[PDB]
Amino acid sequence: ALFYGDRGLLSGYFGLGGAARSLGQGLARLQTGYLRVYALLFVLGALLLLGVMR
Amino acid sequence: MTLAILAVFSVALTLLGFVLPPQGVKRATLLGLALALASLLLTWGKPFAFGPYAVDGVSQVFTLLALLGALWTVGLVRSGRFEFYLLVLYAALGMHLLASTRHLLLMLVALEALSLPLYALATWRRGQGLEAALKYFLLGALAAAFFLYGAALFYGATGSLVLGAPGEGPLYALALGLLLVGLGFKAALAPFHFWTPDVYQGSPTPVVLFMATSVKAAAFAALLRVAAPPEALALLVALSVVVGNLAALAQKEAKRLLAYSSIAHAGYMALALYTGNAQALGFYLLTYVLATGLAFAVLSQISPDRVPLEALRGLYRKDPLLGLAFLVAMLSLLGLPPLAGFWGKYLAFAEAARAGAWGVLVLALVTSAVSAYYYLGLGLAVFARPEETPFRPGPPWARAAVVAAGVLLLALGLLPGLVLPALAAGG
Amino acid sequence: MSYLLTSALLFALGVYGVLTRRTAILVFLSIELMLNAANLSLVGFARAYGLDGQVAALMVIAVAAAEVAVGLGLIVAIFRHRESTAVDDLSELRG
Amino acid sequence: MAPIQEYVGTLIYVGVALFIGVAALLVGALLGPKKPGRAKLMPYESGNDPAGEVKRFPVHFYVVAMLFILFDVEVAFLWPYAVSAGGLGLYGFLGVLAFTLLLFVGFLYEWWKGVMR
Amino acid sequence: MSLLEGLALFLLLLSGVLVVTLRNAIHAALALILNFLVLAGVYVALDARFLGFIQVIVYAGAIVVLFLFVIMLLFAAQGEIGFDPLVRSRPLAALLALGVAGILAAGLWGLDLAFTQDLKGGLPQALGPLLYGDWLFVLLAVGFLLMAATVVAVALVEPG
């Protein structure tokens, strides 16, 4: 049973890696390729940065 | 007075190309850049200023790096258009003027002088190259507008447009933010990073070499002049590293993945901005420039238009030295001992911790440990089975250049107490 | 001081254009408006701080001329044989 | 130099010229037979399609206009030297000469390539 | 002052609204020329005189003329073709359009400045010794930049 549990622990570490990759591709899907999307995200980030600077 | 050399060579060759074959113009450009590099060597520790043009450690170091990348990428380019060489020279001078000045408006003129040829150099005429050029041009003009209103508000805070002014409160902060926007855009800092993957993917590989060396060098050379507050710096670093590495995990193409890697590395380099060391940052960028130029010369020997991840594989069987150099380069870009990437990473992290920013640094380190996923999916892949991939195994020029770059990466990893003692005034 | 607030408002207007405009040409026009709002702010701060912002704005105009030339050359190169310059027709490169 | 009064006089000059031109437009438009016809409102040339369906016009006009914008920037930069010249001495003269030589090299490039294209 | 100042600002803002709202490219560029005229008048009112003359000569006379030359070579007036409309971005941009103003307004709000300097009018008589001198390096850089711009556009189009 504890061998099974170690198997499950390693599988959970794999699940951590899989969550990392999934989050990564969700952030990668943010780059659609339409220039309007890129300029909108650019302006949003620049406004956010200028707001933080206070 | 190296700028004189650059201006003279560019303006002379502009007309001489009508009388000289592209090969002759190529050899002339090579001579001019090598002479400018030598002039930088003989002027080590000889500061020279005329007006807003001011030569300090940053100027010398980063212009040396840019000239190195320019020489390398010219070594590869053989096209029968002298223009495809002239622009290189131009870009060089431009990037030179970017690192060698404190005047904000002269900074804008240098930004334009270096950015204009870079839009056109990416035109192998592939439609995606034009898509990249248009994305690049529009976003760069937007960033130029932002930088310009920042310089305007800076002049609003003080009677001069030269950095080093005392600076007011909120208006000075706003002006500095609007300058940092464009400067980090040139430096591939998030959340301004969107252009980098598309542009790196669409453009021919040697052009991306030239970019990933000289653009980033000159952009950080201009960034060090700014007195960026640490909070905005934390925002940029966190967003850049996190999104860069995460989205780089999901990438299937070599050039796009590497553009994301350059975003993560720009996030790492921005840590020296906590202290503005400009010695550690000079060393870091030296190592990164060498490694990435090497990798992209190899990628050029593989494919100009686009390189898939499988193409990198089996290279050792194809070329032994190339596979070794790609592996070493991947490890150095990971920042692993005893490689110089580790010294640069350590120096930047030391400056950042010395400024007392802990969560950001730890997050950058954890994400850099995450980066081993694809850094290893690239470095080790050299030994895999060669799948279908166009492969042109280069001339001896690029082979010897790659060998020297890799040897220097590992040598500066083992024994940094050789050059790093001379990255300040240069005893 | 009302002039500098107006410069900021024009900067915002050019931003609204760049975001909203579909074609390259109108985006570039909005960018010209942004640069001239910056020039207005530079002229104001030169009147406040002694006339150097005027030569600054002059150089800005030169910059706009260079980037207008290059942008129009690029636009022609991409969309002469091609149909409407609409950039949403170019989505090959995706994340 | 010049007072601001001349500038309001300029504005009045423009207002008067504009008002008289609009007056001439009113005279022309109000006085007429007013019998529209379908063929009258047609563009030109005998049935349809004077030019009609044609491809986009030659780019040479773009080339000429871009040349003009860059060299008109040149002229705008040459003017402050034209007025304040003797005060700049041989140093300013030599600087403006270098500037002119650079842009004239740009012209020399565009000419040796030529635009018949 | 405020009598004509309000008029000039209303014309500037309305022209910007036109050039960013109207779908007719020609109307937009025309509104931008009206904008430049209003702005050169404001420059004049700001004791910046020579720069206003170059603004009308270069910007209106040269740049937007080439804009008009290209868009008349390439009709492009009916821009709404190949839409991918993305309607939500039209109001949303206004949000961002407000935002990029607000923070600027914060930097300038509560800010008192010394707008008192006897420029004696922005004549080139006084701008010459600045241009050739403290600014000569920027001038030479700009000239070389223009040469590079010509070469880039020429090598860029160059049908062959």
Side-chain angles (χ1 to χ4, degrees), chain C residues 1 3 12-13 16 21 25 29 32 36 40 47-52 61 64 79 88, chain E residues 5 19-22 46 55 59 67 74 83 94 97 100 113-115 117 130 135:
Chain C
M1 174 57 59
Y3 308 98
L13 287 182
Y16 179 85
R21 292 310 195 187
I25 330 174
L29 209 65
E32 296 304 312
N36 279 274
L40 174 83
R47 179 191 42 156
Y49 294 105
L51 189 141
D52 283 278
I61 285 171
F79 317 88
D88 306 323
Chain E
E5 165 172 327
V19 78
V20 308
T21 301
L22 302 188
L46 284 192
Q55 173 79 36
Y59 253 120
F67 260 106
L74 188 51
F83 306 84
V100 78
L113 241 183
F115 290 127
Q117 274 207 235
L130 302 207
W135 292 85

mmCIF file of all heavy atoms in Angstrom, chain C residues 1 3 12-13 16 21 25 29 32 36 40 47-52 61 64 79 88, chain E residues 5 19-22 46 55 59 67 74 83 94 97 100 113-115 117 130 135:
data_model
loop_
_atom_site.group_PDB
_atom_site.id
_atom_site.type_symbol
_atom_site.label_atom_id
_atom_site.label_comp_id
_atom_site.label_asym_id
_atom_site.label_seq_id
_atom_site.Cartn_x
_atom_site.Cartn_y
_atom_site.Cartn_z
ATOM 1 N N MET C 1 -1.044 76.019 -18.383
ATOM 2 C CA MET C 1 -1.089 74.638 -17.926
ATOM 3 C C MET C 1 -2.207 73.859 -18.625
ATOM 4 O O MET C 1 -2.107 72.644 -18.809
ATOM 5 C CB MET C 1 -1.273 74.602 -16.411
ATOM 6 C CG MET C 1 -1.471 73.220 -15.824
ATOM 7 S SD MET C 1 -0.137 72.082 -16.210
ATOM 8 C CE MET C 1 1.260 72.952 -15.504
ATOM 9 N N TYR C 3 -2.802 73.884 -21.644
ATOM 10 C CA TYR C 3 -2.210 73.339 -22.857
ATOM 11 C C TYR C 3 -1.616 71.950 -22.622
ATOM 12 O O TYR C 3 -1.742 71.067 -23.474
ATOM 13 C CB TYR C 3 -1.157 74.314 -23.384
ATOM 14 C CG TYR C 3 -1.670 75.737 -23.535
ATOM 15 C CD1 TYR C 3 -1.439 76.689 -22.554
ATOM 16 C CD2 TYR C 3 -2.389 76.122 -24.655
ATOM 17 C CE1 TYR C 3 -1.904 77.983 -22.690
ATOM 18 C CE2 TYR C 3 -2.855 77.415 -24.797
ATOM 19 C CZ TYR C 3 -2.611 78.341 -23.812
ATOM 20 O OH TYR C 3 -3.081 79.630 -23.951
ATOM 21 N N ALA C 12 -4.169 60.697 -25.353
ATOM 22 C CA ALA C 12 -5.250 59.748 -25.112
ATOM 23 C C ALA C 12 -6.075 59.508 -26.369
ATOM 24 O O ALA C 12 -6.511 58.380 -26.632
ATOM 25 C CB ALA C 12 -6.141 60.277 -23.989
ATOM 26 N N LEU C 13 -6.315 60.566 -27.144
ATOM 27 C CA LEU C 13 -7.101 60.442 -28.369
ATOM 28 C C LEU C 13 -6.361 59.611 -29.414
ATOM 29 O O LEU C 13 -6.952 58.739 -30.063
ATOM 30 C CB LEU C 13 -7.423 61.835 -28.917
ATOM 31 C CG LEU C 13 -8.471 62.629 -28.135
ATOM 32 C CD1 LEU C 13 -8.754 63.981 -28.775
ATOM 33 C CD2 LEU C 13 -9.729 61.818 -28.008
ATOM 34 N N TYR C 16 -6.712 56.063 -28.321
ATOM 35 C CA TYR C 16 -8.028 55.543 -28.685
ATOM 36 C C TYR C 16 -8.081 55.190 -30.165
ATOM 37 O O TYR C 16 -8.687 54.184 -30.556
ATOM 38 C CB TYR C 16 -9.110 56.564 -28.325
ATOM 39 C CG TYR C 16 -10.520 56.138 -28.672
ATOM 40 C CD1 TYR C 16 -11.267 55.354 -27.803
ATOM 41 C CD2 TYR C 16 -11.115 56.534 -29.861
ATOM 42 C CE1 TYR C 16 -12.562 54.962 -28.120
ATOM 43 C CE2 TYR C 16 -12.409 56.147 -30.181
ATOM 44 C CZ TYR C 16 -13.123 55.362 -29.307
ATOM 45 O OH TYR C 16 -14.401 54.977 -29.618
ATOM 46 N N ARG C 21 -8.590 51.920 -34.461
ATOM 47 C CA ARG C 21 -8.390 51.896 -35.905
ATOM 48 C C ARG C 21 -8.062 50.493 -36.399
ATOM 49 O O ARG C 21 -7.317 49.745 -35.759
ATOM 50 C CB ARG C 21 -7.277 52.865 -36.306
ATOM 51 C CG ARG C 21 -7.632 54.327 -36.094
ATOM 52 C CD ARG C 21 -8.987 54.633 -36.702
ATOM 53 N NE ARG C 21 -9.241 56.062 -36.837
ATOM 54 C CZ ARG C 21 -10.411 56.572 -37.211
ATOM 55 N NH1 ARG C 21 -11.438 55.772 -37.470
ATOM 56 N NH2 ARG C 21 -10.559 57.882 -37.334
ATOM 57 N N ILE C 25 -2.998 52.833 -41.907
ATOM 58 C CA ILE C 25 -2.816 54.251 -42.206
ATOM 59 C C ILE C 25 -3.397 55.115 -41.092
ATOM 60 O O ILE C 25 -2.767 56.079 -40.636
ATOM 61 C CB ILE C 25 -3.454 54.591 -43.563
ATOM 62 C CG1 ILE C 25 -3.413 53.384 -44.500
ATOM 63 C CG2 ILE C 25 -2.687 55.722 -44.219
ATOM 64 C CD1 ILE C 25 -4.150 53.591 -45.811
ATOM 65 N N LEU C 29 -1.661 57.700 -38.485
ATOM 66 C CA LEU C 29 -2.150 59.056 -38.268
ATOM 67 C C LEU C 29 -2.335 59.336 -36.778
ATOM 68 O O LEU C 29 -1.916 60.387 -36.269
ATOM 69 C CB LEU C 29 -3.455 59.247 -39.045
ATOM 70 C CG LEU C 29 -3.801 60.651 -39.533
ATOM 71 C CD1 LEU C 29 -2.779 61.094 -40.550
ATOM 72 C CD2 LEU C 29 -5.185 60.648 -40.157
ATOM 73 N N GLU C 32 0.904 59.997 -35.272
ATOM 74 C CA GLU C 32 1.347 61.361 -35.555
ATOM 75 C C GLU C 32 0.709 62.348 -34.586
ATOM 76 O O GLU C 32 1.370 63.274 -34.094
ATOM 77 C CB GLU C 32 1.002 61.737 -36.999
ATOM 78 C CG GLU C 32 1.708 60.905 -38.045
ATOM 79 C CD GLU C 32 3.223 60.937 -37.895
ATOM 80 O OE1 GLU C 32 3.801 62.037 -37.745
ATOM 81 O OE2 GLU C 32 3.840 59.853 -37.908
ATOM 82 N N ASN C 36 2.628 64.770 -31.859
ATOM 83 C CA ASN C 36 2.418 66.217 -31.815
ATOM 84 C C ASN C 36 1.840 66.680 -30.476
ATOM 85 O O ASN C 36 2.087 67.814 -30.059
ATOM 86 C CB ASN C 36 1.534 66.642 -32.979
ATOM 87 C CG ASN C 36 2.319 66.773 -34.262
ATOM 88 O OD1 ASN C 36 2.913 67.818 -34.542
ATOM 89 N ND2 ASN C 36 2.355 65.696 -35.038
ATOM 90 N N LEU C 40 3.575 69.462 -28.234
ATOM 91 C CA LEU C 40 2.914 70.555 -27.537
ATOM 92 C C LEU C 40 3.395 70.635 -26.093
ATOM 93 O O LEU C 40 3.714 71.722 -25.592
ATOM 94 C CB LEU C 40 1.396 70.378 -27.610
ATOM 95 C CG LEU C 40 0.574 71.370 -26.791
ATOM 96 C CD1 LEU C 40 0.386 72.672 -27.561
ATOM 97 C CD2 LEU C 40 -0.758 70.763 -26.416
ATOM 98 N N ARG C 47 8.811 76.875 -22.934
ATOM 99 C CA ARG C 47 8.373 78.181 -22.452
ATOM 100 C C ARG C 47 8.579 78.323 -20.948
ATOM 101 O O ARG C 47 8.861 79.424 -20.458
ATOM 102 C CB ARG C 47 6.903 78.403 -22.812
ATOM 103 C CG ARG C 47 6.332 79.727 -22.331
ATOM 104 C CD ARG C 47 4.830 79.758 -22.496
ATOM 105 N NE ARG C 47 4.235 78.485 -22.111
ATOM 106 C CZ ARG C 47 2.970 78.338 -21.722
ATOM 107 N NH1 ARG C 47 2.154 79.389 -21.666
ATOM 108 N NH2 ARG C 47 2.517 77.139 -21.382
ATOM 109 N N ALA C 48 8.434 77.226 -20.201
ATOM 110 C CA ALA C 48 8.661 77.263 -18.757
ATOM 111 C C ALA C 48 10.146 77.220 -18.397
ATOM 112 O O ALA C 48 10.579 77.922 -17.476
ATOM 113 C CB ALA C 48 7.930 76.103 -18.079
ATOM 114 N N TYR C 49 10.938 76.417 -19.115
ATOM 115 C CA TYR C 49 12.314 76.084 -18.755
ATOM 116 C C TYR C 49 13.347 76.599 -19.756
ATOM 117 O O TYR C 49 14.521 76.219 -19.667
ATOM 118 C CB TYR C 49 12.461 74.565 -18.607
ATOM 119 C CG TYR C 49 11.679 73.980 -17.447
ATOM 120 C CD1 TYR C 49 10.512 73.260 -17.667
ATOM 121 C CD2 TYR C 49 12.094 74.160 -16.137
ATOM 122 C CE1 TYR C 49 9.787 72.731 -16.617
ATOM 123 C CE2 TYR C 49 11.371 73.627 -15.079
ATOM 124 C CZ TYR C 49 10.220 72.917 -15.326
ATOM 125 O OH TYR C 49 9.504 72.391 -14.276
ATOM 126 N N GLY C 50 12.948 77.438 -20.710
ATOM 127 C CA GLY C 50 13.917 78.107 -21.556
ATOM 128 C C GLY C 50 14.236 77.500 -22.911
ATOM 129 O O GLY C 50 15.409 77.246 -23.216
ATOM 130 N N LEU C 51 13.201 77.225 -23.713
ATOM 131 C CA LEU C 51 13.320 77.181 -25.173
ATOM 132 C C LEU C 51 14.046 75.956 -25.741
ATOM 133 O O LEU C 51 14.042 75.748 -26.960
ATOM 134 C CB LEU C 51 14.008 78.469 -25.660
ATOM 135 C CG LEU C 51 14.113 78.827 -27.151
ATOM 136 C CD1 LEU C 51 13.914 80.314 -27.387
ATOM 137 C CD2 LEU C 51 15.450 78.418 -27.698
ATOM 138 N N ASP C 52 14.643 75.110 -24.900
ATOM 139 C CA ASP C 52 15.306 73.928 -25.448
ATOM 140 C C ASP C 52 14.296 72.893 -25.927
ATOM 141 O O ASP C 52 14.566 72.153 -26.886
ATOM 142 C CB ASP C 52 16.245 73.329 -24.406
ATOM 143 C CG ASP C 52 17.523 74.119 -24.270
ATOM 144 O OD1 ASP C 52 18.435 73.910 -25.095
ATOM 145 O OD2 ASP C 52 17.607 74.960 -23.351
ATOM 146 N N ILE C 61 9.705 66.398 -34.970
ATOM 147 C CA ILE C 61 9.105 66.476 -36.302
ATOM 148 C C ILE C 61 9.974 65.733 -37.307
ATOM 149 O O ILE C 61 9.475 64.998 -38.171
ATOM 150 C CB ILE C 61 8.896 67.945 -36.713
ATOM 151 C CG1 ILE C 61 7.708 68.549 -35.956
ATOM 152 C CG2 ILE C 61 8.716 68.065 -38.229
ATOM 153 C CD1 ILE C 61 7.545 70.055 -36.135
ATOM 154 N N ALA C 64 9.361 62.097 -36.877
ATOM 155 C CA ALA C 64 8.087 61.728 -37.477
ATOM 156 C C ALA C 64 8.220 61.606 -38.988
ATOM 157 O O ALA C 64 7.646 60.699 -39.590
ATOM 158 C CB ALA C 64 7.006 62.745 -37.105
ATOM 159 N N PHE C 79 1.106 45.623 -48.781
ATOM 160 C CA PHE C 79 -0.271 45.661 -49.279
ATOM 161 C C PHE C 79 -0.412 46.371 -50.625
ATOM 162 O O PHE C 79 -1.402 47.064 -50.865
ATOM 163 C CB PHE C 79 -1.218 46.328 -48.282
ATOM 164 C CG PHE C 79 -1.006 45.915 -46.854
ATOM 165 C CD1 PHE C 79 -0.102 46.595 -46.054
ATOM 166 C CD2 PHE C 79 -1.681 44.832 -46.319
ATOM 167 C CE1 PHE C 79 0.100 46.226 -44.739
ATOM 168 C CE2 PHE C 79 -1.481 44.456 -45.001
ATOM 169 C CZ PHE C 79 -0.586 45.154 -44.214
ATOM 170 N N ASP C 88 -5.881 42.338 -39.248
ATOM 171 C CA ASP C 88 -6.573 41.161 -38.742
ATOM 172 C C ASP C 88 -6.651 40.047 -39.778
ATOM 173 O O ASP C 88 -7.122 38.948 -39.451
ATOM 174 C CB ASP C 88 -7.978 41.539 -38.275
ATOM 175 C CG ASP C 88 -7.971 42.678 -37.260
ATOM 176 O OD1 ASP C 88 -7.053 42.729 -36.412
ATOM 177 O OD2 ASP C 88 -8.896 43.519 -37.299
ATOM 178 N N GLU E 5 -8.540 81.097 -26.303
ATOM 179 C CA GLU E 5 -7.939 79.849 -25.837
ATOM 180 C C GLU E 5 -8.969 78.726 -25.835
ATOM 181 O O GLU E 5 -8.689 77.608 -26.289
ATOM 182 C CB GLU E 5 -7.331 80.047 -24.447
ATOM 183 C CG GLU E 5 -6.984 78.776 -23.691
ATOM 184 C CD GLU E 5 -6.213 79.069 -22.415
ATOM 185 O OE1 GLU E 5 -5.436 80.047 -22.406
ATOM 186 O OE2 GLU E 5 -6.388 78.334 -21.417
ATOM 187 N N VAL E 19 -10.580 62.716 -36.210
ATOM 188 C CA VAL E 19 -9.533 61.884 -36.790
ATOM 189 C C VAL E 19 -9.464 60.501 -36.150
ATOM 190 O O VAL E 19 -8.905 59.575 -36.752
ATOM 191 C CB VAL E 19 -8.177 62.606 -36.696
ATOM 192 C CG1 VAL E 19 -7.601 62.518 -35.288
ATOM 193 C CG2 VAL E 19 -7.230 62.041 -37.703
ATOM 194 N N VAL E 20 -9.992 60.334 -34.934
ATOM 195 C CA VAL E 20 -10.030 59.009 -34.319
ATOM 196 C C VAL E 20 -11.387 58.308 -34.431
ATOM 197 O O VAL E 20 -11.454 57.086 -34.237
ATOM 198 C CB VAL E 20 -9.596 59.078 -32.839
ATOM 199 C CG1 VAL E 20 -8.254 59.800 -32.712
ATOM 200 C CG2 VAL E 20 -10.680 59.735 -31.982
ATOM 201 N N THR E 21 -12.458 59.031 -34.751
ATOM 202 C CA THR E 21 -13.796 58.453 -34.837
ATOM 203 C C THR E 21 -14.224 58.201 -36.276
ATOM 204 O O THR E 21 -14.692 57.106 -36.599
ATOM 205 C CB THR E 21 -14.816 59.373 -34.136
ATOM 206 O OG1 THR E 21 -14.444 59.554 -32.764
ATOM 207 C CG2 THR E 21 -16.234 58.794 -34.197
ATOM 208 N N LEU E 22 -14.050 59.192 -37.148
ATOM 209 C CA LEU E 22 -14.513 59.074 -38.523
ATOM 210 C C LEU E 22 -13.883 57.875 -39.218
ATOM 211 O O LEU E 22 -12.712 57.550 -39.004
ATOM 212 C CB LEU E 22 -14.228 60.365 -39.301
ATOM 213 C CG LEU E 22 -14.853 61.643 -38.730
ATOM 214 C CD1 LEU E 22 -14.664 62.810 -39.693
ATOM 215 C CD2 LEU E 22 -16.337 61.427 -38.399
ATOM 216 N N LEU E 46 1.851 80.779 -27.893
ATOM 217 C CA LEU E 46 2.831 80.336 -26.905
ATOM 218 C C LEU E 46 4.217 80.920 -27.149
ATOM 219 O O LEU E 46 5.206 80.405 -26.611
ATOM 220 C CB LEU E 46 2.916 78.805 -26.883
ATOM 221 C CG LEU E 46 1.757 78.104 -26.173
ATOM 222 C CD1 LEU E 46 2.031 76.611 -25.915
ATOM 223 C CD2 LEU E 46 1.379 78.835 -24.878
ATOM 224 N N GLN E 55 5.701 73.730 -38.614
ATOM 225 C CA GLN E 55 4.582 72.818 -38.393
ATOM 226 C C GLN E 55 3.608 72.856 -39.568
ATOM 227 O O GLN E 55 3.247 71.814 -40.126
ATOM 228 C CB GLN E 55 3.865 73.200 -37.090
ATOM 229 C CG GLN E 55 2.578 72.448 -36.791
ATOM 230 C CD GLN E 55 2.832 71.057 -36.229
ATOM 231 O OE1 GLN E 55 3.779 70.842 -35.473
ATOM 232 N NE2 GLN E 55 1.975 70.109 -36.588
ATOM 233 N N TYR E 59 4.628 69.485 -41.647
ATOM 234 C CA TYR E 59 3.597 68.502 -41.303
ATOM 235 C C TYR E 59 2.434 68.534 -42.291
ATOM 236 O O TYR E 59 2.086 67.519 -42.911
ATOM 237 C CB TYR E 59 3.093 68.756 -39.885
ATOM 238 C CG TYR E 59 3.564 67.731 -38.892
ATOM 239 C CD1 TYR E 59 4.322 68.097 -37.795
ATOM 240 C CD2 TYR E 59 3.255 66.394 -39.053
ATOM 241 C CE1 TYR E 59 4.756 67.160 -36.885
ATOM 242 C CE2 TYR E 59 3.681 65.449 -38.143
ATOM 243 C CZ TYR E 59 4.439 65.836 -37.066
ATOM 244 O OH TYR E 59 4.863 64.894 -36.157
ATOM 245 N N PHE E 67 0.671 61.075 -47.083
ATOM 246 C CA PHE E 67 -0.432 60.234 -46.620
ATOM 247 C C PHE E 67 -1.552 60.221 -47.650
ATOM 248 O O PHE E 67 -2.027 59.159 -48.072
ATOM 249 C CB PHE E 67 -0.959 60.740 -45.273
ATOM 250 C CG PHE E 67 -0.451 59.961 -44.102
ATOM 251 C CD1 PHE E 67 0.503 60.489 -43.267
ATOM 252 C CD2 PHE E 67 -0.947 58.699 -43.830
ATOM 253 C CE1 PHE E 67 0.964 59.761 -42.191
ATOM 254 C CE2 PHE E 67 -0.492 57.974 -42.761
ATOM 255 C CZ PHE E 67 0.464 58.504 -41.940
ATOM 256 N N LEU E 74 -3.862 54.082 -53.351
ATOM 257 C CA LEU E 74 -4.498 52.895 -52.801
ATOM 258 C C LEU E 74 -5.731 53.388 -52.053
ATOM 259 O O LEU E 74 -5.619 53.873 -50.923
ATOM 260 C CB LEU E 74 -3.539 52.149 -51.880
ATOM 261 C CG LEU E 74 -3.973 50.784 -51.353
ATOM 262 C CD1 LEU E 74 -4.427 49.880 -52.496
ATOM 263 C CD2 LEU E 74 -2.863 50.141 -50.536
ATOM 264 N N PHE E 83 -13.420 42.460 -41.483
ATOM 265 C CA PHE E 83 -13.580 43.092 -40.178
ATOM 266 C C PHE E 83 -12.822 42.396 -39.055
ATOM 267 O O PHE E 83 -11.834 42.930 -38.532
ATOM 268 C CB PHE E 83 -15.068 43.135 -39.790
ATOM 269 C CG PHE E 83 -15.961 43.769 -40.819
ATOM 270 C CD1 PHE E 83 -16.440 43.032 -41.891
ATOM 271 C CD2 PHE E 83 -16.346 45.092 -40.701
ATOM 272 C CE1 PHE E 83 -17.269 43.608 -42.834
ATOM 273 C CE2 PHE E 83 -17.179 45.670 -41.641
ATOM 274 C CZ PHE E 83 -17.639 44.925 -42.707
ATOM 275 N N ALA E 94 -11.834 53.199 -25.169
ATOM 276 C CA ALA E 94 -12.173 54.454 -24.502
ATOM 277 C C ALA E 94 -11.767 54.408 -23.035
ATOM 278 O O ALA E 94 -11.207 55.376 -22.503
ATOM 279 C CB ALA E 94 -13.664 54.752 -24.665
ATOM 280 N N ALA E 97 -8.312 54.721 -23.260
ATOM 281 C CA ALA E 97 -8.118 56.094 -23.705
ATOM 282 C C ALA E 97 -8.274 57.064 -22.541
ATOM 283 O O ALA E 97 -7.576 58.079 -22.461
ATOM 284 C CB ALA E 97 -9.083 56.427 -24.841
ATOM 285 N N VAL E 100 -4.868 56.343 -20.013
ATOM 286 C CA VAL E 100 -3.621 56.990 -20.431
ATOM 287 C C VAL E 100 -3.681 58.506 -20.279
ATOM 288 O O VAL E 100 -2.640 59.166 -20.326
ATOM 289 C CB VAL E 100 -3.247 56.597 -21.881
ATOM 290 C CG1 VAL E 100 -4.073 57.368 -22.891
ATOM 291 C CG2 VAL E 100 -1.759 56.836 -22.133
ATOM 292 N N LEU E 113 3.482 75.668 -12.113
ATOM 293 C CA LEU E 113 4.722 75.799 -12.853
ATOM 294 C C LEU E 113 4.973 77.256 -13.204
ATOM 295 O O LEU E 113 4.056 78.083 -13.239
ATOM 296 C CB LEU E 113 4.696 74.937 -14.121
ATOM 297 C CG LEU E 113 5.763 73.842 -14.199
ATOM 298 C CD1 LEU E 113 5.670 73.109 -15.524
ATOM 299 C CD2 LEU E 113 7.159 74.420 -14.003
ATOM 300 N N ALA E 114 6.247 77.560 -13.452
ATOM 301 C CA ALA E 114 6.676 78.903 -13.835
ATOM 302 C C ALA E 114 6.645 79.005 -15.352
ATOM 303 O O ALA E 114 7.614 78.674 -16.037
ATOM 304 C CB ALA E 114 8.068 79.199 -13.286
ATOM 305 N N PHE E 115 5.520 79.486 -15.881
ATOM 306 C CA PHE E 115 5.364 79.700 -17.312
ATOM 307 C C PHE E 115 5.850 81.081 -17.727
ATOM 308 O O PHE E 115 5.420 81.602 -18.765
ATOM 309 C CB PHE E 115 3.898 79.519 -17.731
ATOM 310 C CG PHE E 115 3.409 78.093 -17.654
ATOM 311 C CD1 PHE E 115 2.260 77.768 -16.943
ATOM 312 C CD2 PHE E 115 4.073 77.086 -18.332
ATOM 313 C CE1 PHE E 115 1.814 76.459 -16.887
ATOM 314 C CE2 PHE E 115 3.629 75.778 -18.270
ATOM 315 C CZ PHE E 115 2.502 75.469 -17.553
ATOM 316 N N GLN E 117 8.806 83.109 -18.944
ATOM 317 C CA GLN E 117 10.110 83.349 -19.531
ATOM 318 C C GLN E 117 9.909 84.209 -20.764
ATOM 319 O O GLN E 117 8.985 83.974 -21.550
ATOM 320 C CB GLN E 117 10.830 82.039 -19.876
ATOM 321 C CG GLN E 117 11.609 81.449 -18.706
ATOM 322 C CD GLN E 117 12.782 80.616 -19.154
ATOM 323 O OE1 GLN E 117 12.906 79.448 -18.789
ATOM 324 N NE2 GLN E 117 13.642 81.206 -19.968
ATOM 325 N N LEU E 130 21.534 77.736 -30.845
ATOM 326 C CA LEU E 130 21.197 76.494 -30.143
ATOM 327 C C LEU E 130 21.338 75.270 -31.043
ATOM 328 O O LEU E 130 21.878 74.237 -30.625
ATOM 329 C CB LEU E 130 19.774 76.558 -29.586
ATOM 330 C CG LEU E 130 19.441 77.684 -28.626
ATOM 331 C CD1 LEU E 130 18.328 77.165 -27.748
ATOM 332 C CD2 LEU E 130 20.674 78.064 -27.785
ATOM 333 N N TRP E 135 22.998 71.758 -29.667
ATOM 334 C CA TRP E 135 22.199 70.771 -30.379
ATOM 335 C C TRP E 135 22.817 70.298 -31.690
ATOM 336 O O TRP E 135 22.195 69.503 -32.398
ATOM 337 C CB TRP E 135 20.790 71.320 -30.635
ATOM 338 C CG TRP E 135 19.995 71.489 -29.372
ATOM 339 C CD1 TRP E 135 20.016 72.557 -28.529
ATOM 340 C CD2 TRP E 135 19.077 70.545 -28.803
ATOM 341 N NE1 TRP E 135 19.162 72.341 -27.472
ATOM 342 C CE2 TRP E 135 18.576 71.113 -27.617
ATOM 343 C CE3 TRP E 135 18.632 69.275 -29.181
ATOM 344 C CZ2 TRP E 135 17.653 70.461 -26.810
ATOM 345 C CZ3 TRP E 135 17.722 68.628 -28.377
ATOM 346 C CH2 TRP E 135 17.237 69.222 -27.205
#
